[PDB]
Structure formats: structure tokens, C-alpha cells
Write an enzyme that holds these catalytic residues in place. Sequence first.
Site, mmCIF file in Angstrom:
data_model
loop_
_atom_site.group_PDB
_atom_site.id
_atom_site.type_symbol
_atom_site.label_atom_id
_atom_site.label_comp_id
_atom_site.label_asym_id
_atom_site.label_seq_id
_atom_site.Cartn_x
_atom_site.Cartn_y
_atom_site.Cartn_z
ATOM 1 N N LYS A 152 -13.809 59.424 -0.473
ATOM 2 C CA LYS A 152 -13.800 59.659 0.813
ATOM 3 C C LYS A 152 -12.807 58.163 0.673
ATOM 4 O O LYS A 152 -12.946 56.944 0.437
ATOM 5 C CB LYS A 152 -15.260 58.869 0.585
ATOM 6 C CG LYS A 152 -15.928 57.582 1.930
ATOM 7 C CD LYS A 152 -16.769 56.726 2.122
ATOM 8 C CE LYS A 152 -16.445 55.923 3.144
ATOM 9 N NZ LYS A 152 -15.571 55.243 4.171
ATOM 10 N N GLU B 212 -12.300 47.735 -8.780
ATOM 11 C CA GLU B 212 -11.089 47.524 -8.601
ATOM 12 C C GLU B 212 -11.741 46.694 -7.627
ATOM 13 O O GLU B 212 -11.400 47.124 -6.457
ATOM 14 C CB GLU B 212 -9.597 48.314 -8.330
ATOM 15 C CG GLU B 212 -8.556 47.743 -8.516
ATOM 16 C CD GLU B 212 -7.783 47.707 -10.014
ATOM 17 O OE1 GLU B 212 -7.597 47.238 -11.022
ATOM 18 O OE2 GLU B 212 -8.776 49.060 -10.653
ATOM 19 N N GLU C 197 -11.005 34.519 -1.194
ATOM 20 C CA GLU C 197 -9.806 35.979 -0.787
ATOM 21 C C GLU C 197 -10.174 35.714 1.143
ATOM 22 O O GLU C 197 -11.048 36.475 1.317
ATOM 23 C CB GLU C 197 -10.380 37.506 -1.530
ATOM 24 C CG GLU C 197 -9.595 38.398 -1.090
ATOM 25 C CD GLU C 197 -9.669 39.651 -2.092
ATOM 26 O OE1 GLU C 197 -10.328 40.355 -1.575
ATOM 27 O OE2 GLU C 197 -8.544 40.552 -2.248
#
Lengths: 491, 491, 491, 490
Positions: D187, D262, D393
Site C-alpha cells: 500500500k 522504520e 519529530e
Amino acid sequence: TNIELKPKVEAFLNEEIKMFINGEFVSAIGGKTFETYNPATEDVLAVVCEAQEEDIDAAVKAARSAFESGPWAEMTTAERAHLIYKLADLIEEHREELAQLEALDNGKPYQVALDDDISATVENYRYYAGWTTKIIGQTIPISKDYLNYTRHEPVGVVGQIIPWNFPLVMSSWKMGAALATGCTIVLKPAEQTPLSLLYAAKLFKEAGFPNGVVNFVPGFDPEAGAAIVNHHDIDKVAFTGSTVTGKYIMRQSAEMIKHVTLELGGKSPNIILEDADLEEAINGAFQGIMYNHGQNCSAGSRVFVHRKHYETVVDALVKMANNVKLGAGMEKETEMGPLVSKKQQERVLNYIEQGKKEGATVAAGGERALEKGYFVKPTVFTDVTDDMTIVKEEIFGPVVVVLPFDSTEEVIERANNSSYGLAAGVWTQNIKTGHQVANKLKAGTVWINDYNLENAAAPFGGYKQSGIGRELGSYALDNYTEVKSVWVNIK
Amino acid sequence: TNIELKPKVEAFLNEEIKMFINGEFVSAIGGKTFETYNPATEDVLAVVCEAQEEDIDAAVKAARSAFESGPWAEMTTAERAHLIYKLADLIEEHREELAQLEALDNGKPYQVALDDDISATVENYRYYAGWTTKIIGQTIPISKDYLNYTRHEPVGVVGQIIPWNFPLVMSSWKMGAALATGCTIVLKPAEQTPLSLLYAAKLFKEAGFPNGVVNFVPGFDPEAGAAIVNHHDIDKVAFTGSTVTGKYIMRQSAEMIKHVTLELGGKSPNIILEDADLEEAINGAFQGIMYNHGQNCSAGSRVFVHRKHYETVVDALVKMANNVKLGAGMEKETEMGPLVSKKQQERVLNYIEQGKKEGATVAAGGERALEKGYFVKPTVFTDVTDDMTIVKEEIFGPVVVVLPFDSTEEVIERANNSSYGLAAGVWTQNIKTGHQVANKLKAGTVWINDYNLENAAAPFGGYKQSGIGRELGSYALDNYTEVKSVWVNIK
Amino acid sequence: TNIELKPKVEAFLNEEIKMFINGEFVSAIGGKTFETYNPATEDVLAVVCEAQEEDIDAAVKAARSAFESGPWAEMTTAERAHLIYKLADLIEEHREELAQLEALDNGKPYQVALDDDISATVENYRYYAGWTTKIIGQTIPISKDYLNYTRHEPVGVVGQIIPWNFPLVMSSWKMGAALATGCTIVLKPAEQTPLSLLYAAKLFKEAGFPNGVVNFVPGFDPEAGAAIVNHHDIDKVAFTGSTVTGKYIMRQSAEMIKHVTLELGGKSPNIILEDADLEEAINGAFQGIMYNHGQNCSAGSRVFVHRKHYETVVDALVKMANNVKLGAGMEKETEMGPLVSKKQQERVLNYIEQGKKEGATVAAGGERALEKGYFVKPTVFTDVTDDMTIVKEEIFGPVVVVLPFDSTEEVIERANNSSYGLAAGVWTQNIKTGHQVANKLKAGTVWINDYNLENAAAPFGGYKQSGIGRELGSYALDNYTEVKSVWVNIK
Amino acid sequence: NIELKPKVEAFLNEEIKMFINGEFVSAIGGKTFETYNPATEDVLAVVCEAQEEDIDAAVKAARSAFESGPWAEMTTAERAHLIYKLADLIEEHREELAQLEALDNGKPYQVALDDDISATVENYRYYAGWTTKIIGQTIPISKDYLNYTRHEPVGVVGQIIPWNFPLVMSSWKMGAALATGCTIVLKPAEQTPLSLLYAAKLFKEAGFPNGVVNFVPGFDPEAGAAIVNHHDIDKVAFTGSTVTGKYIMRQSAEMIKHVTLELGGKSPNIILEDADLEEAINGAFQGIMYNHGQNCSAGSRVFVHRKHYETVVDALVKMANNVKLGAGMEKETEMGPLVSKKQQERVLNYIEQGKKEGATVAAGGERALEKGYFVKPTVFTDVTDDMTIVKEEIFGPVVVVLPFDSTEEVIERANNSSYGLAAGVWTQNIKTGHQVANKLKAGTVWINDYNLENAAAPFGGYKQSGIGRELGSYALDNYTEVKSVWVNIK
Ligand code: NA
Ligand code: NA
Ligand code: NA
Ligand code: NA
Ligand code: NA
Ligand code: NA
Ligand code: NA
Ligand code: NA
């Protein structure tokens, strides 16, 4: 003031020194003997049984038998590992005896034989004990219709010859990898230095090595040496020693198409660049050449120095050279022992003369030292050029040549312009220039801001005329191995 | 009915065939040419520029210089992989051209040069282009004071010499692995069969190989061959051909302590045990020896048959031998073409003679065939014993000896009792017998219930006098690499 | 009758069993203790300090601080390898004590704990001691402008939880690989079997392990286990036990993104094909399920038998099942002891009932045995179908299910038709079938003509829900390593 | 203004189809969703929307292609050839793919072409080479046994990727999985499904047999969950936010599914006192601003030795105000917009949160232009370790610059984080570079450089930046099950 002799080394020197064949300590079939010397005093140090051609066929048959049938052929890899490992322990146990033997028989200082040689030999065995269970082949995916795998099979009976400069440690460089793979061994120690190894033979027996797995045959290159090189039923040969005798062995080996491994000499460059940490680099340059009295294939015998630092390092090397404490290996004071033989001493005195005759200046040393024994003074040569004999050829004594240079690209060109390529030293604080330089040097080992480091786990060997192959690390295993590619049809 | 000549092979053959040095198509410096023959018809097939010592010298200089500087020294591993890949595509593209040149120049049937040779060569290149980015060194955990790492550096300029039996595919066995490591090349194809390779040169150029990375130097062993084995600036040497010539190469290489890889002759046993699937083992036994006219180093030239099946296999091998359709490699019906030369036809008829004079029976074949060309009839020998020249020596022709045996331990012993050990085949349906026997045979490749399989991914090479080293697989890369151990002091 | 208690196990058992944190033998901070039982008699065997959440914290701090500083962090791989090897020596010196402890605490027969468990624990530590020097990274050739290299760094502090069925050996599967990489360890033994490991703690201390490298916390899953899986300062987790709890551990580990390695249950097939050596297969099938009273995640608990042989193998297993001698582990004549706990005997007797309820037949066994003890009779079920509970679920007792099949394609389908895939056995004499079938079974280890074999060198772990990752062999190292990729710009 | 390639115009003129079982198909239930051009905020394309039942058709097609037919029967060489043919086609279609990336993602055309496309071509070439060298072991234990291991493909893999490098990330996933012989349900992100869906033509053309790869665009709570929870998927790989990662691993637990993750980071880029300052300034700047800061391993924390702090601050502020903001398809753009409205808002909101906790915005800190999701490159000053913008982040062109006084202090401050994706070290000293590299808890460390990735070198996180590595030989192990075979030959 002296190191008290270990009782076991007394009991061992008190008798004729026997060879070790097929599990037994034996005389030469024909009873010949030869003498080994204490190079500090020049007295006979021991009388040793001399292997002739016939003692070598006996050693080959014992190794051939131990390789084909009996416990060595049938043990699991865990059992073989365990043998090598117990050996390492017994050696460690007899560390002082072996270090005295090295000091007495080779000449080097007791305390360095103990800290360097003995401990390295122990750790080498221990490292190779570890490989026995981990020598893996491949399974290769090619097609659905086949199982494809390889086996790493021990080549068989191995003939090994080693020089006199690091006697015991070199026996281990040879035997650890060869044994780890399941080979059997016929190993000849150098004529100058047989005692270390033949003492160790007690330790192989105690560890339980089956009869024949290991065979030690002392003597001379033209007799015991040749008979190994020329034996029809030895599957593979490994040699370290003169670039010259290497040529011979490869030539002889042509005949049987026998794999050869060669660790030969060097004229290794030790490069002090402009941004080196000079404190460290001066010590490195000095240790580089003086360690083991220059009796080291990988010695930094060419010390290149950027022009800015040329005078400082010459001055330092000169001062440290005239400070070395020469004397007997078994005297606690000694920092550098004598060379191994009269012949060795004469050859390096010769080179020093050729040095002078060619117009180089001796800024320290240059001559024999002391009342008796095969000593030479640490020597530093200056006002030297690239095409001089002393700058080109391996001397194999405590003799260094120091050489100014002006640019990086220049020093790489002059360091590389040699048919030797065993090792090299590079001293720079800069991250970029350390790697870039290491990359461009044609040498089997490069130390960046160090020199003379070896470890069981890191391969060692020559480019160009310094060698074929590597010893130590995983790499040494491949030398002792024959690769078999099995295809199983499964369609 | 004739395979029609390809327009491009016609153009190529209409002109003097040039050498390939430093990116350029050129004549020999002194203008010498030699002739290469069509072995089916004995006509001149082409005139070819002949490389002398001075040409070899120009090839080394161009190789030395493509190695030290310029695009090939500077490109990423990915750019290098891509060049090798595009090369394979270009070869796939000219597959019919190259297959005809092999049929014409070497002799073998066109269709099998197309399906086996061209296809294996294309595949070898593709496999090796894949290694370029994956040629890995170690980082070695020894101590917290050092970073320890190894580099696998290309050895440099590589001298490579190949025989005439699989001319193109053999050029890839050498060049794939070498180019993959970053090496540079000077390669001599066999006087009998230079055309494949010289045509293929167009494709290295078209693929964009930089100048001098690859150099093609057609000619003779006493001249071009010797100049390669003797050159002082060639770093490493690789050769396949007679065990005879291997010894010479290894001997000359000794002068310069040059690494050598040798792929040599065989007398490979093809063993049909009691529980073989016999219909299969018969075809493998026939194919094992007859494939490529028996001009195959790993040919199953000794077919060992368990006594229960001995008569059955002989009869089958006889009936099959006599049905092979001999003819020109460029005629559609041909199953087996001529031997490569008059000399080879003579060597083999000679071996057959010796066969007869030592008491063996010629059960089929035994002589030349057809009006002209270097043909020999597929040949079956029975009533042979282990000590016969014909059962001990490589014939290099479509000549097989069938040997009965009574036990597995017997056949193991007799298979192994040979100076050769390139390959072996064992046929048995049993899981334990298959691997037991495979483990026990002294041979670089063992096929269980198959024969004569090669693939780029699987190493190939001889024990004992059949060679030193391996080609194909990861293994072949080691032959073109020098291991550098770098110590980075981080105290 | 009875094997007499070793003096040192007597001394150990007369005392409260202490924990091992930061190199010290300690009580639980809160002073809680719990009981462990002889499964043969139901008696209290020893009272043991019970680790609480706070004890895990103290354990983790000691392990954290032993990882960041002091000898364990500074020491070379050679010294670390040596510590692990001296450990193995001590475990071997105490082999009889450890085996008694295992027999008494887990329940299995003394002789087998000694011959299997202890020797395999010794051999596992010997094997990993060899790895510490050979955990190598890569140097990756990419571009001349960089040095690329990877380091395999130990992850740090690891939390390991193990079951009760092979208590000591399972402690070595976890710690051998973890310590070889240089990790530090917080390890919890099963509440049923803490004795082995807590005795082994003396041996770590005596071998010279630095304070805090290894920390053993006995107790319970809701307190001690939970505190381990949830601890924020534990870097990596490893567990072996029921598929159920594995789920929980993987789920919980998600909150910290913590690497998990899981070794779980199975329903492994043991498949007897038409051409099996029926004798060896019968024995293989019986040992496969009955070894360690069936308390073996890889037990061959579904025996598939080709139709031609079904009846024969059913007869022989029934007879064999009826003949095993049940007794205490410390009685010299016992072949199978009791299951580990009341709870376990109840679960398996419950499975037996369920099997009956679903319409299977009990060809042998199927009930408790003896006056006292968690005993269950070896049990054979016939008339079974693939969707029955007893053929789908891990029973963890001496209970087997025998199924007939008619084709190879059929038995592959049915064997794979499972959420488990830990192991599989195939019995056939045919070389093609053995490899074909083993290639298509979805299992982490496959035995062709044998069963239940493990070795430190060969990886073990499951496909599908039998686990994630491998233990043993080189593979296990990867679980304890964090890969660092270093780019050194050298432009 | 760069003009649309004719094959790109053709592709966008039509509803965009999913790729299932070698076929271009609409969603079974017919749903569609829009994807946008983030420079103009218009709909760029209407895409078929994969629902649970589509993921289920994809898994069947994949399961079937793994277990029988050409992909299961091909030699490793044949399989390598297909992968290399793909790489070529991608290269043939490089301008088309680049424009789709610029249009769909927002990044500048020239960078998409020079970085993204060439990287994805290289990845496939690299992995094509492995299919023949995925070797297992023969293990010498005992003479009674042959012991060997096979590295078998794990089976049908489930792959989910983010929007910041859409095509290259499809390769980091597919390259290594296909090399091992697995089949794929992949996907692409809802923001950027186009490249992948165009590249699907190239798989068909290269000759991938039906069902080897299947591409299913849509949303994380529908297509995404379907994939992670599917009973017939053998293994799952994801790259994206640390938070969605926890969910993936959480769901994966229920079936003892291998996970590769990841995830995000807050990577340090550390300029020591003996850095080459001209080089370290450029690297610090590229390290955060590359790809508009939408880069998990963006050096979003620049630590500068006190001696050099003000120098680098000055330079970073100057370079931040110099960047040319604009549409990806415009010739002069150096940095485009963020990928979406929601992203632009998250990032402005991080900016607000930094001001309100007391940091100073030395450059940027606000939206740019008339339309599109742009934010000015932003440099934060007077920051402390404690602040939100320094711990979290941000995922945009927003850098935080911090002074330090000692190597021990910076190592500890760099390491004091739940992240460990990457780090950069700038120092001319040979000892100091490797000591520091050695000490940073980060999956890749660049010494005197930043942001380098290559198919040959592993990439992955310590601690919460991930599990497993992608790229290099290491990536293969995720797609492999190890089978250890024992053959009794007593
Ligand atoms: Na002596
Ligand atoms: Na050499
Ligand atoms: Na010819
Ligand atoms: Na050989
Ligand atoms: Na108990
Ligand atoms: Na799994
Ligand atoms: Na979009
Ligand atoms: Na992690």
C-alpha cells in the site's frame, strides 16, 4: 643480574632433545644430532636429534594415517575444538618455561617473550579453537531441480616450515588454522630455534592429541626442509622466511600442483606526515624498527618523515638508539638481545658496510657491541637515497633508514616503489588523510597512528614479493581447505 | 542442409581480424598474422593479427594505466556493475553471431553453442555484475582501543590465458570475476579459436568499457602466452589448459611471487552403483563423456559400473556411440562435430592405439570418420584395468572406458586413485549412499544422479593435480583480491 | 532405588535459595520467598527468594551499569571469550550436582539430564565463547569517496524469560549468544525450576564474571516476568514458552519498539513414507514424542504413516507406550518421570478427555499413573481427524496422535496445515524424496531419517506461530546486536 | 514551468486503477478518493480506493503466485532478470516518474529525477544481483550428519510506506523482498499513490507473473489495517510515524508476524571544535532542509561547539532565508510545499509551541506564498533540551541549533532521546570521529557528511526509531525464514 632458570627448563635442557613423531618422543632413525646455541654467550645450549629425509617420511605416514582413520578422523568438531583449547591452557600453564626457552634459544628478552610471544601463542590457539565449529560452506539457490551445497574439506597432510625470529608464536600461526580445519601436520622448526616447539610437544601429548595429528621434525633446510617441500604425499605446504627460499618452494610445488602459502620479507615504510602527533610517531618509528632487534619481516625499516620534522625525528631516534640497553635475554636489565646467529650478525654488519660504502652516514650505531655474543648496535642511517642497497633490501637487524619527503603524493610513490609490500605505518591526525593514504599503500597491513600490532583475529600477509596468501583471521582457514561443490539432482 | 551465415559474421570474416588493445582495434605492431581453421572442412576460416611480446607489452601498459587512473579507477561499484550488465545484454543480442563463430571456429554444433555456451556466458556476466557492489570486507571486534577492518582490493593487472574447447564461456569464467573486483585485463584466447572473443570485443566497446580495461591478444603460447606469464608488471595470473603447461606457469610465477589459479585436466569417474536409476544413469554416462566431443576437462571418461549392470551399460553405450550423427557444426543434423585440430585428432587416435596395444577391446568406434575435417568416432573401450594408459591419462576425445566393480569401498578407492580430481558423478537412489560417497570422493564437483552441470553461482575446480583455486561462485572473487588489514588507533 | 544426594546439592538445599544480583547472592528486598517442588513426591523441595518489581529494577541497574562501565565494557573480546569458556569448565566440573538438581526440580531422569542437558549446556557455552572474537561487520565498497563500514554493537541490557522443561540448557540458549556479543543480562527462570540456574550462579561468580553482567531473578510471571517485559531500561527481550504468552510479550514490547525474539509451541509432524527403514522410523517416532515426557515444544506429536505401514507402526507404538518405566528422576531405573506440576498433569489429562469426547480412540495410556506424583501414562490416539482438538493443539505431554496417509502430496498439505511450524521429521531412504519433502515442509528444522537433534552450531526456531527468530548457531547472534552503518567521507 | 510528458497526461486523464493479480482494476465496491497537487491544492487525480475485500483479493493473488506457477518455479537467474528488466523500464520512464513525484509529493522535479528515480533504479539493480547469492550454511558438526540451512522466502509480505519518498520507498520494500522470492501486497500512502501506480505498468511489461506484486491505494484505517490484520500475510513491513509503528507491532503480535519498522527520529548533527566549518555549515543545512525536512533522519538538532555557535547560526539564518520556495514542476524551485494541509498545520503548530515555550525564531516560522502547503525554512535559537520542539519529530524544514562545551556533554545530550535513526559528526580528527561515531546510539552515522543512503549500506533505527534494517545485505534477512536441515548419514 639474572633470571633464575625454571626447574622444568633445567630438566629439559639436561638431556638430548627428541623429535616428536606419531605421539612419541624419538631420536632420528639414524642417530644424528646438531647443536643449538645461546646467542648471548655462544655456548652450546642443547643437543637436538636431527631429522633426515627418512624421519620425514615417517612423520608423513603418521600424519597420513592420523588423517584417514582413528580418533582425529572421527571426532566431532566440538571435540577437536576442545583439544586445541586444552593445549592453549597447558601452554598458558607453562608460560615461564616457554618464555625462558625463547630468551635462551632465540635471544630476545625474557619479559617480552612472556608478555608478547607466549600470550599471543595462547590466544591464537584459543581463537582457532573457536573456529572449529564455525568453518561453514554454502548452500546456493540456483534452481528448483537441485540442492546445491559446498563443503570445506581439510586438504589433508600439511607441511609447514617456520623461521627463528618468533619461534613458538609462528608455530601457532601455522598450526592453529591448519588444525582448526581438521588437517594433520608435519612442522619443522628453524635450526637456530628448535627448543620452544619441542618443549611444547609435551603439551600436545598431555592435551590428548591423537597420535600423528602433529609431528615436529627439527633440522636443516637442505635436509629436513627439502624433504617436506619435495614429499609426494604432502597435500599442501606453508612457509615463512626469506623471499629467496619462498621462490624455491613455489618452484618445487609446481610439480605436484600443490597449494602454496608464503609469508616472506619486507621493507615496510613508516610514514610520519606533517600533521602527525610527533610524540607518538617518534615512539612508533623507534619501536617500529627496534622491536625484536629488527628481526621482524614487517619492521618499519624505512622511516619517512615530512621535511618540517625531519631533523627533530632523526635527533630523537639517534638519542633513543644510543640508549638501548644491550645484553642477555635472561638478564633483567636487557632491552635488546643479540641477533640469532653469527651468520645473521655478519649479514647485518655487511649491510651496514654497504651502507657506508654507498655514501650514507651512520648517525648512530654501525657496529658490533659487547664482549661476546651476536650483538649489533641500533643503527640509524641518514643522507640516504632511494636506489641505495640499504634502502632497497631487507637487513633484518636493528637498522633504520630515515628519509625526508615533501608531499603526500611523493611519499606514497616512494613507499610503493618496492617489490616488497608486507606492512606500512601512517601517522596523521587527520581523518581524511589517514584513510586516503591507507587506501593507496600497497601493503597487507596498514597501521594508522600505530605500528607492529598483530592479533589472532586480523589477517597478516604480503602484496607483491612479500607473500602469497594471508595467515591469522578467518582468512587463514581457506589455505587449509579444499572446496567441494555438491549438486544433488532432486527433480 | 546448412545453417545460413549471419550477415554480421560474414562481414567480420571478410576482413583481417584485429586485436583489441587500449579501446582500439589494431594490427600486431610488426604486422604478423596467423590463420585459424574450420575444423569440419580444414579450410582457412580467417586471418588474425598475431600478438608478439611487444604487443603484450602495449596491453600491459594500457591495463596498468586503466587500473591506476581514469574512469575505471574512479567509477562507483554501481557504475561498474552496469557496464558488466550491458555487456551481457549485448552478447545476448549477438547470440546467433557468436554461436556461429563457435560452430565454425571451434567445431561444436551450432544449436548447442547457442543454448549452452552463449547462454552460459551471458548468464556468467549477469551473475558477476551482481557481485560488484557486494564484495565485502570485515570489521573485526578485537579491542576498544582500535577500529580493525579489512579491504578486499582488486589485485591490479591480471594475465589470463584460456583454451579452445568452450572459447567464449571460458573468457567469461576469467573476466566476470576479475572485472567484478575492479581488476584490469590482458587476455589471450587459444590459437585454435580466437574469433568469438575478437568479435565480442565490439561489445565491450559498445557497452562503454573504458580504454585498456580489457585487452585481447590472440596468438601462440611460446610467444604471446610466455610474454604474459613472464611480464614483470602483471600482478596475477590465471590459466586453464594442460596439467603439463600448468606446471610451467606455476614455476615461472615463482620468480615474482605471483598468485596463480589453475584449472587443469581430469579423469573423472562417473559411478553407477547397484541402486542407480539405470535409465537415467545410462544417459548421464553417455552424455558425461560425449558432450562437446569429450573435449571437456571434467568429462566422465571413466564410467564405473556395478557388476550387476555392467553388460547392460556397455551394450547401451555401444548402441548410442554408433548412432551419433557426426557432421559439420553448421549443418542442422549434426550431434557431434570434429575435434578442434589435426594435432588433437592425432593425439586422440594415438591414445586409442595405445588402448589396443595394452590389450583393451574397442567395443565401438576407434578411428576417424568422414571424408575430411578432424573427426573421430565416439569410442567405447572394455576389458580395461586401472593401470592402463587409457584409463589413467586424459584423452580429450569422445573416448570412454567402462569398468566393472563389486563393492562401494572398492569403487571409492579406485575412483580416488588418480592424480586428477576435477569432478565425479555418483548414481544411487539411496539418501545415505548418495552423500556418503560424495563426501568420500576427492573432487571439486560431485553430481549425485546427474553429470556435467555448471552454473555461475557454484565454484568449480580441482583437487590434487586437477588445479589450485576455484572459478565461478563467490569463491572466484578471492583469486582477484588482495586483503588489506587496517588498524586505526582510537585510544 | 535411589541415587544419593551429592554433598554440595545437600548443602545448597539446606538453605534458603538466594537470588543473584550485581555479583551478590541476595534475598528479595521485601524478603518474600516461594516454594518449588519435587514433581515425583509433591514434597517441598526448597524455599526460594521471590523476585518482585523492585528486585528487577535493582537487577536492571546493575546490568545497565555493568554494560556502560567497568571491566565488562573495557575488556577485549579475547578476555570476554575466556570468561565464557571458564564458565563452561565449571558447569562441567559440577555436572553431577546440576543433573541431580534438574532431576529433582524438573522431574526428568538423572542419567538423561546428565548426558543431554548438562553436556549440551557445556557445549553451548564452549561454542559461543568462540564467537566473541568473530562477530564481524562489513566494509562495503560503494564509491572511492567514502569508507563504508558496519559495526555489530551489542544491544545492551537484555531480558530473558525461559520455561521449565529444559531449565539449564534453555538458560544457555539465551545467555550464550547474548554474552558473546557483550550484552548484559537479566534472566528469569521458571517458577517450577529455579534451582539449576541459581546453583549455576556460584559458577558465574567463581569463573570471574564482573558484577552485574548476569542477574538471576526467580519468581512469577505476573510480578517478576511482567516487570521484565515492561521495564523501560531493558533494551531487548527474549522469551520461550506458550504461543499465548508470546503474543502478550510481543504486544507489550510494542510500547518501547523493542526487538523481540520468541521461541514457542509446535505440533510438529513426524512422517513415515512408504520406503522408510521402518525399524528406525518406529523408534524415531516413539522417541520423537516421548522424549522428556513430551514436554518439548518440538515433539513429534502428529505421526503420519503411509497406509501400507499404518497398522504396523500403531502396534509397535502402543507396545512401546505400555512399556516405559515411570518413576522418580532420582531412581536409577526410571525411563520417564512425572510432568512438572499438578497444573500440568491436569491440563494434559484434560486434553486426553477432550480427545475422547471428540471421538478419538485411546489405543494406550490415557490416565494418571502411580500413587503420588504428577505422572501421566504414555498415550497413543488413533481414529483421529485433522480438525480434532488433540491434533491441532500443543498438549505438552507424552501423548501422540497417529494418522494414516495415501500420497506424498497429501501428507505435505496436511503437515503444513497448521499454525505451528517448529520442526518436522521425514523418514525415507530415497535421495530425491527426502530433499523434496524437506524443502516443502514449513518448519524451522527438518530431520531426514532422525528426530529431536539439537546442536549449538545449528539454528532452531519456528515458522508461523512457532516463533520469531532463531536461537543457536551463528543466527542467534543477530538477535543481540544492533547494526551501525558508518560513512566516512574521504573526498 | 515544466510541461507534462504525454504519457503522464494520458495516465492523469483517467481514473487511476489498482494493480491486483497482474490486472489493472477498480475497487470491487467502486470507491474512489482524491489525491492533490500540494503546490496548488487542486485535485490531481481520482484513484480507485482499496477496501478490505480488495486487500483480500490481493492476498489470494499473492498467495497463489507464491505457491504455484512461474514465480515459484523460476531459477534465481530468471528472477534476477525480471528485477533488472524492471530497473531498466523505471529508468526508461524516469522523466514520467519524476513528474508524478513532483506533482503528487511536491518535491522539485530535478531532485526527484536526480535522487529519487536514480536511487530506485539503483535499488532494483542492486537487489537483482542478490537473488543468486542468498546463500545458507553447511555446518560441520559431526560425521554422522550433513547439516545445512536454507534461506527460504517467508511468503506473502505486507508492506506499507509513507509519502515523503514514495517511489524509492516502494523499492526499499520490494527490492529485497522480491530478491528472496516473496510475493507482495503493497500500500502506497494516500497522499502519494501515483508513482507506484504508474510503475505498476513497468512490472507488467517487465514480465512479472500475475499476482507477484499487488498495489492497493487507500487509507490506513481501511486498506492499512486490512493488511496488518490479514490471516494469510506472513510478515509485515512498515515505515511511518513512531505512533503508527506501535499499532502495527501490536496487531502483528496476534499472529507472531515478523515486523520490520522504520520510524521517526530527532537526529543530531554535531559540529565539533575542529570541524571544517565551511563543510559542516552546508551539511547542517542540507541535513535538515533536504526534502523540506520531511525526512525521518533529518538532522533536526544541530549541536555546535560554543566557539562556533554564532557563526553557524548566522550562516543557517542566511541560507534559510535564501531558499527558493515554489511549485515542484517550476524550473527554479529549491524547496516545495509540505505534502498536505494537515502537515502544514502540524508544522506551524510546532512553531507556535516553540515560541510559546520561549525559543526564538531566528528565521522563518510561518507559512509562505498565496496558495499551497508552504512553510518558510525555520531556524530555532535559545532552545533547551527540555523543550517540545527539541524533543519531538517536527517533520518540516525546522531546525533547532544548540551550543555545547564538551565532547562528553554533546554525546550525552545527543543520546538523550527515545530516537536513534541517524547522526552526523563533523571533526577533522581521526580519533575523535570514530570515538564519537562509536558512542552515538544511532543506526547510521555520517562523519563529515549527512543524509547519504545507498542500496549497499544498511539503514535503520536504535530504540524507538525502528526494528530491523533495510537496504544492504541485511534487508534480506527480514524476508527469509531459516530452515535448518539434518540428514542422517550414519
Ligand atoms: Na639458538
Ligand atoms: Na604476492
Ligand atoms: Na578454428
Ligand atoms: Na589442488
Ligand atoms: Na520444582
Ligand atoms: Na512467525
Ligand atoms: Na498528492
Ligand atoms: Na528498536
